[PDB]
Amino acid sequence: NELPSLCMLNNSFYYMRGGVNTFLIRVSDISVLMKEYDVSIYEPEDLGNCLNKSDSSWAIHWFSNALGHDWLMDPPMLCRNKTKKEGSNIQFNISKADDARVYGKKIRNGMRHLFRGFHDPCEEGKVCYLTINQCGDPSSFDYCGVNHLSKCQFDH
Amino acid sequence: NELPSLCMLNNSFYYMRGGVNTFLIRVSDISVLMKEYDVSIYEPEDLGNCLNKSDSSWAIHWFSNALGHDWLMDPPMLCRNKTKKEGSNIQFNISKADDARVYGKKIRNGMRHLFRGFHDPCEEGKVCYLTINQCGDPSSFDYCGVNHLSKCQFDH
Amino acid sequence: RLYWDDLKRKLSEKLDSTDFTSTIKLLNENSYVPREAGSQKDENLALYVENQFREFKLSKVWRDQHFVKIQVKDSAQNSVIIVDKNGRLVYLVENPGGYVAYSKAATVTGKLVHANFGTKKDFEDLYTPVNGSIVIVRAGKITFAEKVANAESLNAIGVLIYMDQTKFPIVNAELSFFGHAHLGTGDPYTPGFPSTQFPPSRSSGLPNIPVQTISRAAAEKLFGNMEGDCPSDWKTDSTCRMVTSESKNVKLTVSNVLKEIKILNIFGVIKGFVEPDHYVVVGAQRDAWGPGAAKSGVGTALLLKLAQMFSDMVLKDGFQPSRSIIFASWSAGDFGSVGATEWLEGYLSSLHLKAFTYINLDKAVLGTSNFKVSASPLLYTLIEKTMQNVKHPVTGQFLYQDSNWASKVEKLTLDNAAFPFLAYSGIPAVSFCFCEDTDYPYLGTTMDTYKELIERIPELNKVARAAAEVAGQFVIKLTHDVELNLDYERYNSQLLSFVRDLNQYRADIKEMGLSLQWLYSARGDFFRATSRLTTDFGNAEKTDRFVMKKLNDRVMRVEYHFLSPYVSPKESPFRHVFWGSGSHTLPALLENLKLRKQNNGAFNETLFRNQLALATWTIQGAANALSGDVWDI
Amino acid sequence: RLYWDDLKRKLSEKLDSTDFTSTIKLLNENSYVPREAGSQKDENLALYVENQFREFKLSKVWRDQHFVKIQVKDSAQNSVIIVDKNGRLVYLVENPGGYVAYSKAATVTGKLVHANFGTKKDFEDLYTPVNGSIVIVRAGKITFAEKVANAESLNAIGVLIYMDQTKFPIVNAELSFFGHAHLGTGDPYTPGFPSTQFPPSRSSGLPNIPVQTISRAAAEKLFGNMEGDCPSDWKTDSTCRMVTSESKNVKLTVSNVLKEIKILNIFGVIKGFVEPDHYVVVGAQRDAWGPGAAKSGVGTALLLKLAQMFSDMVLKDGFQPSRSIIFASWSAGDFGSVGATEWLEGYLSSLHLKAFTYINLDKAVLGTSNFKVSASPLLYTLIEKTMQNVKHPVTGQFLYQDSNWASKVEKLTLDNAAFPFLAYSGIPAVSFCFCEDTDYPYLGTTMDTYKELIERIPELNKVARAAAEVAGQFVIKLTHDVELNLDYERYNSQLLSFVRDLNQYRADIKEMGLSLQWLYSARGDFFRATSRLTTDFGNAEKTDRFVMKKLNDRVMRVEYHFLSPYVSPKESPFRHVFWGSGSHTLPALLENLKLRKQNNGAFNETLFRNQLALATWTIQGAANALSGDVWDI
Ligand SMILES: *[C@@H]1O[C@H](CO)[C@@H](O[C@@H]2O[C@H](CO)[C@@H](O[C@@H]3O[C@H](CO[C@H]4O[C@H](CO[C@H]5O[C@H](CO)[C@@H](O)[C@H](O)[C@@H]5O)[C@@H](O)[C@H](O[C@H]5O[C@H](CO)[C@@H](O)[C@H](O)[C@@H]5O)[C@@H]4O)[C@@H](O)[C@H](O[C@H]4O[C@H](CO)[C@@H](O)[C@H](O)[C@@H]4O)[C@@H]3O)[C@H](O)[C@H]2NC(C)=O)[C@H](O)[C@H]1NC(C)=O
Ligand SMILES: *[C@@H]1O[C@H](CO)[C@@H](O[C@@H]2O[C@H](CO)[C@@H](O[C@@H]3O[C@H](CO[C@H]4O[C@H](CO[C@H]5O[C@H](CO)[C@@H](O)[C@H](O)[C@@H]5O)[C@@H](O)[C@H](O[C@H]5O[C@H](CO)[C@@H](O)[C@H](O)[C@@H]5O)[C@@H]4O)[C@@H](O)[C@H](O[C@H]4O[C@H](CO)[C@@H](O)[C@H](O)[C@@H]4O)[C@@H]3O)[C@H](O)[C@H]2NC(C)=O)[C@H](O)[C@H]1NC(C)=O
Ligand SMILES: *[C@@H]1O[C@H](CO[C@@H]2O[C@@H](C)[C@@H](O)[C@@H](O)[C@@H]2O)[C@@H](O[C@@H]2O[C@H](CO)[C@@H](O)[C@H](O)[C@H]2NC(C)=O)[C@H](O)[C@H]1NC(C)=O
Ligand SMILES: *[C@@H]1O[C@H](CO[C@@H]2O[C@@H](C)[C@@H](O)[C@@H](O)[C@@H]2O)[C@@H](O[C@@H]2O[C@H](CO)[C@@H](O)[C@H](O)[C@H]2NC(C)=O)[C@H](O)[C@H]1NC(C)=O
Ligand SMILES: *[C@@H]1O[C@H](CO)[C@@H](O)[C@H](O)[C@H]1NC(C)=O
Ligand SMILES: *[C@@H]1O[C@H](CO)[C@@H](O)[C@H](O)[C@H]1NC(C)=O
Ligand SMILES: *[C@@H]1O[C@H](CO)[C@@H](O)[C@H](O)[C@H]1NC(C)=O
Ligand SMILES: *[C@@H]1O[C@H](CO)[C@@H](O)[C@H](O)[C@H]1NC(C)=O
Ligand SMILES: *[C@@H]1O[C@H](CO)[C@@H](O)[C@H](O)[C@H]1NC(C)=O
Ligand SMILES: *[C@@H]1O[C@H](CO)[C@@H](O)[C@H](O)[C@H]1NC(C)=O
Ligand SMILES: *[C@@H]1O[C@H](CO)[C@@H](O)[C@H](O)[C@H]1NC(C)=O
Ligand SMILES: *[C@@H]1O[C@H](CO)[C@@H](O)[C@H](O)[C@H]1NC(C)=O
Ligand SMILES: [K+]
Ligand SMILES: [K+]
Secondary structure, eight states, rough: OOSSSEEEEETTEEEEEEEEEEEEEEEESOOOOOOOSSSSSSSSSGGGGSSSSSGGHHHHHHHHHHHHHOOSSOOEEEEOTSSSSOOOOOOEEOOSGGGHHHHHHHHHHHHHHSSSTTTOOOOOSSSSSSHHHHHHHBTTTTTTTTTGGGGGBOOO | OOOEEEEHHHHEEEEETTTEEEEEEEEOOOOOOTTTSSSSEGGGGGGHHHHHGGGGHHHHHHHHHTTTTTTTTTEEEOOOTTTTTSSSEEEEEOOGGGGGGHHHHHHHHHHHSSSSTTOOOOOOSSOOOEEEEBBBGGGGGTSSSSTGGGOOOOOO | OOHHHHHHHHHHHHHTTHHHHHHHHHHHTTSSOOOOOHHHHHHHHHHHHHHHHHHHTEEEEEEEEEEEEEOOOOOOOEEEEETTTTTTTEEEEEOOSSOOTTOOEEEEOOOOOTTTTOOOOHHHHHHSTTTTTTEESBBSOOOOOHHHHHHHTTTSEEEEEEEEEETTSSSSSSOOOEHHHHHSSSSOOOOOOOOOOOOOSSSSSSSSOOOEEOOOHHHHHHHTTTEOOGGGOOOOOOTTTEEEOEEEEEOOOOOOEEEEEEEEEEEEEEHHHHHHEEEEEEEEEEOOSSIIIIIIIHHHHHHHHHHHHHHHHTTTTTOOOOOOEEEESSSGGGGHHHHHHHHHHHHTTEEEGGGEEEOOOOTTTSSSSSEEEOGGGGGHHHHHHHHHTTTTTOOOSSSSSOTHHHGGGGOTTSTHHHHHHIIIIIIEEEEEEEOOOSOOTTTSSSTTEEEEEHHHHHTOOOOHHHHHHHHHHHHHHHSSSSSOOOOTTHHHHHHHHHHHHGGGTTTTTTTOOOHHHHHHHHHHHHHHHHHHHHHHHHHHHHOOOOHHHHHHHHHHGGHHHHBBBTSOOOOOOOBBTTTSOOSSHHHHHHHHHHHHSSSSSTHHHHHHHHHHHHHHHHHHHHHHHSSOOOTOO | OOOOHHHHHHHHHHHHHHHHHHHHEEEEEEEEOOTTTTTTHHHHHHHHHHHHHHHTTOSEEEEEEEEHHHHOHHHHOOEEEEEEEETTTTEEEESSSEEETTTEEEEEEEEEETTTTHHHHHHTTSOOOOOOOOEEESSSBHHHHHHHHHTTTTOOOOOEEEOOOTOOOOOTTOOOEEEOOOOOSSOOOOOOSSSOOOOOSOOOOOOOOOOOEEOOOHHHHHHHHTEEEEOOGOOOTTOOOEEEEEEEEEEEEEEOOOEEEEEEEEEEEEOSSSSSEEEEEEEEOOOOSSOOOIIIIIHHHHHHHHHHHHHHHHTTTOOOSSEEEEEEEEGGEEEEEEHHHHHHHHHHTTTGGGGGEEEETTTTSSSSEEEEEEOOOGGGHHHHHHHHTOOOOOOOBSSHHHHHHHGOOOOOOTSHHIIIIIIIIOOEEEEEEESSSSTTTTSTTTTTTTHHHHHHTTHHHHHHHHHHHHHHHHHHHHHHHSSSSOOOTHHHHHHHHHHHGGGTTTTTTTTTTTTOHHHHHHHHHHHHHHHHHHHHHHOTTTEEEEEHHHHHHHHHHGGGGGOOOTTTTTSOOOBTTTTOOOOTTTTHHHHHHTTTTTTTTTTOHHHHHHHHHHHHHHHHHHHHHHHHHOOOO
């Protein structure tokens, strides 16, 4: 097995494949997690409690770093407690807004390196997020079925 | 005082004036009296019980004779009992029908002599009547008011 | 306390020496002769009846006064006129002596069409469309109110009514007559609020067309101007014809006016010795358009004599009624039991807890040949036992001659004061009479006199005497026995009969996805409820007035629990699912369902599912109301 | 027969040694813990309660079984989703642990709009049109059923409900909760006939939109995507927002399914010694969505202990209730008193002749600060005398501290099992509790546990003890005194208050040509009727059970005669013109009339004239029903 491989379908769907697992990656102005109620990830080990299998946290670990995320320095990403029935959802706050402006610049830079042709939907002064759902979880809906995922020709 | 005087308004209204009394005379296919229930006039004296005042029977007596009616020989005319609230109504059966055919011929002949321009409305095989109501009785309705009687210029 | 055998004898022997004809004659005197409701003469009689009650020394006598709107004829005459469509000249045929209360005041001109009795069937069998025409019908078979409704239902613009000589062999063909066409009882103009100001009527049951009564002579004069022979099936005069000639049509002018009147219901009461707060009510109509000897006099006479007799039996002979007996002299009966209904309406839902039976005395004597009875099934047993020991006035045989009389009993109709009691108030009621297969011809005329009455019925005194004995025995049984003589088991036959009919469509109930199972279960539950009640009565100590009170109260509520709880008494006063009127009655449910054999759109599947439901609920409710204690199921 | 003083002492001393908390704890064990109606655990508790009744040796214990359609959540999850109108990609926010019974199963997508409590006023005060939008509202103030109706009334397409932290200071923001949105009681899917086949519902009171309960966390996440600060007037969290951003709207998916269940009402009865066919009914809800310690446990515990105590007082201590006492353990209370209503519906119009009072025991213990009561005015006197000699569990002072408490009494609401008794059956009813100015936050959650309960209320045993004493004293007074402790005179104040309000429009009644005279006369007549009844009671020989029966029966019928006779119980079950729901209630008449100051077309003059009429008739009827013998007027 190599490292995780990536694919971009259109501007609304990016996907990472890590071993036998696939993840839906989206960027939009919609958030469903909050510091107050969900899990704050301060270190990579914390990712274990965001996914059905603590050991596929690896692909998200690799991806966060590939993206430019600095564990010690940057705002912790949030994630839905593995136990909830929703379930998986890792959320990066990349808003072009004051508190997260420079960090967002960076992550989007990462996205440009990872997905050639990445389209930046984030608007000045507005809120914006990067969201990852593991394919198969309810939170991935049908976004990883044949008419989407199988249409994406993977590389990397 | 002379004898009664006559006037024809149009084909629907003829009038006789006898002293201070006036009578509406009509010819049509409508009857409201029947032998079974109303008064049969076999002799002129019987007319007394057809009118409010038994003494104005005179004008109807004169008129019946003027018409050609034969008291001894002809079908008795009918009349509404003076006591009923309708009230006055003398009815001659002049139907161009078998039983009264010849008599009807005769009365109509009388009407032609009395009212120049008399129009015969009676139809072959159909029933037909000559009807007299004293002006003022309910059975004369408004037929003897200003728009009718006063429009008639009397002669005779 | 006396023995039933003694009470029977006492009643009978008091009756033997009672003079009925004198009283009927007395009520036909000029002081009372023409006594239209609210008139001074009606008020005179009201005062006389009231005085008599005071002389009889009843426990209490009182007045129940009401102000109501009736209709009387105007100083302007109603008229029936023939018009010549050629030139439109008119000929007056009659200014009727009589009129029909509650007719729309209006003038209408159209073709005239005969429709026999104006029954629903008579109209369908017509080969001449009634629409836009004035209709003429014979009196009889059904009320004026129904004739008008049926005709109005087909868009007729007016109604004439005459008495044909076949149904009314009256010599005088100029006779005029009276009636009303309100399709209900009580005051039709009852605003729930006082007013100057004028509010529309709504669900009043009032005619929207003019209706008028005419003499046979006037009808035959109309026939004189009509064509088409009448069906021999109608069995009517050869005079009769069907339609106006082409060139002619009829004009009817009715100008009746609304008048507010003061009616008096006069009441007397003999208080009960055990449960005085429960009563049997005995009533008669005191008002009449003309003399109304048979219409009003007979009844009022019986009312007076019965009141007197029972007062004497209590005071002299030791009779001690358990429950109270109320004697009621009603006014405005001629307008649709208005007096009776107004009083009933004060106690819409409470009266059935006090009055357990109403006995109507109206038109109890009309003939000699027959004895007819109409009543709640709850009184069939009382009625039967009473016929088994009352003798026919002429014949000498007991009235009871047919073991099967109960299945041939016709139901109370709207023109009977007994009707609102049963169908609106839920109080078992009974009307009865000696009569013929023929209507009493002079009813509603000026010929309804004592002299006429005593002439067609020379045994008048004896016949009135037999009428008093049945009413009297009713009243004694009802206030003497410790149980109430209301046979609640009778409604098992009724429910059986009804379901038996309904089961003739067990197929059509399939094609609609419906089960009749919950209805069968309601019927079963009612059966159980009555069976338990009979057992309870048997096991009760007849001398324990507390347990009897409890059991009797349950019996007293049977009738009322057949009033549909799912319809407003204002929209449809006659709520009794067996005996009332409307889409909530069992009969209506059947008629709607019979309209399913025709593939015509008359059937109303939705309505039926609601009817099925409401019926089931009503019947279940009654069964549950009868079962007693909530832990007994 | 014992003296009231001894019965008071006996009850109190039995109460002193009664262990309430043990029973509440026992009902919170795993055998019963999650006991949704119809579930095996509910059925377990039903069996346990039934056994306990048998051990108490009540006169008879029985089952009242019913099959009903409830709604439970599907194996498919309900979901709350945010949609990006740009590209229409969705983000799952929650799959709620809870749900709202009777929600339309549907999926709807629109804008989200906050409407505070969703009260009728809250909607009008909105500067954002709700039409075509999903609405979010806080729990409280009014039932879910009302919130849905109000919203549906403005064409909202869905409803979310959360518990804000200001009204529900619950630490766990992920807590999910349950309720129903049926705007009535009983089974909403009650076809009057059995069916495979599917018939529409009609006047069911069911939502046509999806409604769903969400955690505060999920609401705040929704607020995260909304704009506009909430009015400080709402006094809510700073988190709250008003409307979704331009680019976003919410999607709600509810997929609840209909399930038929077997519920059991468990009944025990202590038979009366004089009139056993009359009962006081004491009931409590046995079912709950979660553990429902306060929701269900307290009530059921009191039900059990009261049953035990009274059984001991009859068998050991010589207590001899005149009338029967029935103890009722209801099921499907959580769905709208369904158990209670189904039973009530077997005796639509007959129950008020047997049950003269219902005492509800639900949620009697929720706090310590206050004692609240809601009831028919017929019980205000009983309630007052009872508060005058029952002591506050913490405070030590008598509950009675405000001479004016009766004018500040709020009426029974739809979520109270006491409601259908009073407003649908016409049986006086009372609910009461110890509580705060704050709703018990854990109701309808999985946090409604004994441990939670015993923590907020460490004096639980003492407080439950005081709750039992009021219910117990009610029950003793009611079955001990020879008169019924129903204060019928109280409805004079009520009628006075109502007319007093109505008279604030004596001008507008002129401009419509209407007199209020017949209504004043009805009020006067009711006053007379009560005065006469009080006199009769005074003049009666208290030892004559026949006269008392008669007078007591009259008192027992007061309540029922305020049920409007002019509306079908199927179309509008809550017929009580004071306390029911619909256009036939006195309040409705006032509201329609208040809409006449605005020259907007909302006022309905015609409706008012009918309302005026029906009210007058209803009130007259009640006055006439109370007056007694028809010759007394
Ligand atoms: C993901 O990250 C983002 C960004 O970090 C984060 O969103 C921020 O959240 C914080 C705190 O929750 C918000 O801070 C609040 O600011 C309140 C006033 O907000 C107004 O002013 C903002 C600044 O002015 C901007 O605009 C001018 C020109 O317009 C511009 O020149 C400036 O440079 C500057 O950018 C403004 O951005 C903001 O805009 C809102 O407008 C709409 C909403 O209507 C929406 O489109 C925007 O997204 C944004 O909501 C707004 O107009 C201030 O009152 C408030 O203070 C509260 O808390 C303090 C605690 O100290 C209390 O004492 C006080 O009483 C208040 O209750 C608070 O500081 C900030 O506005 C957010 N930023 C944005 C862009 O939304 C998300 O929450 C993160 N997501 C998650 C899930 O964690
Ligand atoms: C005013 O005077 C008139 C005329 O005198 C009178 O009207 C007559 O009244 C009598 C008795 O009431 C009617 O006599 C009856 O005749 C019955 C059969 O009638 C039919 O046949 C008639 C004769 O045939 C005619 O037609 C052919 C061709 O069509 C022609 O060649 C002939 O010459 C002949 O004229 C016929 O006229 C008549 O016509 C009717 O048609 C329509 C009605 O539909 C209408 O327009 C007409 O006016 C007329 O009504 C019809 O077709 C016969 O059955 C009947 O017998 C009954 O009584 C006997 C008693 O012995 C019973 O035993 C038997 O069972 C029957 O019940 C009777 O003899 C005569 O038809 C009337 N004539 C007309 C023209 O109407 C009015 O009543 C008088 N008015 C008043 C108020 O007194
Ligand atoms: C992830 O969730 C688990 C599950 O706990 C449930 O979900 C929580 C959000 C909250 O709803 C709890 O009430 C639920 O029990 C959490 O495990 C719990 O951890 C707490 C604190 O350490 C502990 O008291 C409980 O016993 C644990 N429950 C169980 C079933 O083990 C866990 O803490 C959550 N993880 C994170 C990082 O938030
Ligand atoms: C004309 O009418 C008078 C009035 O009698 C009334 O009208 C009749 C049609 C009939 O309705 C009677 O019942 C009415 O009394 C008739 O006078 C009567 O004549 C009869 C017979 O001779 C006699 O018995 C009555 O006493 C009379 N009545 C009165 C009040 O005097 C009269 O006979 C009628 N004339 C004709 C020619 O028909
Ligand atoms: C996570 O676990 C749940 C339940 O065990 C399962 O339904 C779901 O498919 C799992 N998620 C993935 C991505 O496989
Ligand atoms: C006939 O008498 C009546 C009543 O006396 C009267 O009204 C009418 O005018 C009289 N008829 C005539 C023509 O004067
Ligand atoms: C006869 O003449 C009068 C006067 O104009 C008129 O009113 C009436 O209609 C006429 N009648 C006929 C039938 O011509
Ligand atoms: C009655 O109905 C028919 C069909 O609608 C119509 O043609 C006819 O004119 C009507 N008849 C009358 C007299 O109104
Ligand atoms: C049949 O009944 C239903 C319900 O009562 C009603 O909606 C419909 O209009 C009725 N149809 C007819 C023909 O009146
Ligand atoms: C992305 O591509 C898939 C496949 O055609 C399509 O179904 C989807 O709608 C696309 N989404 C967007 C936002 O273009
Ligand atoms: C609500 O109503 C207004 C006016 O009828 C309409 O213009 C608007 O589109 C509606 N709003 C929605 C979201 O349906
Ligand atoms: C007002 O009430 C009347 C009678 O109840 C009804 O006909 C009318 O439609 C109502 N108007 C409104 C606005 O609903
Ligand atoms: K006796
Ligand atoms: K006692």
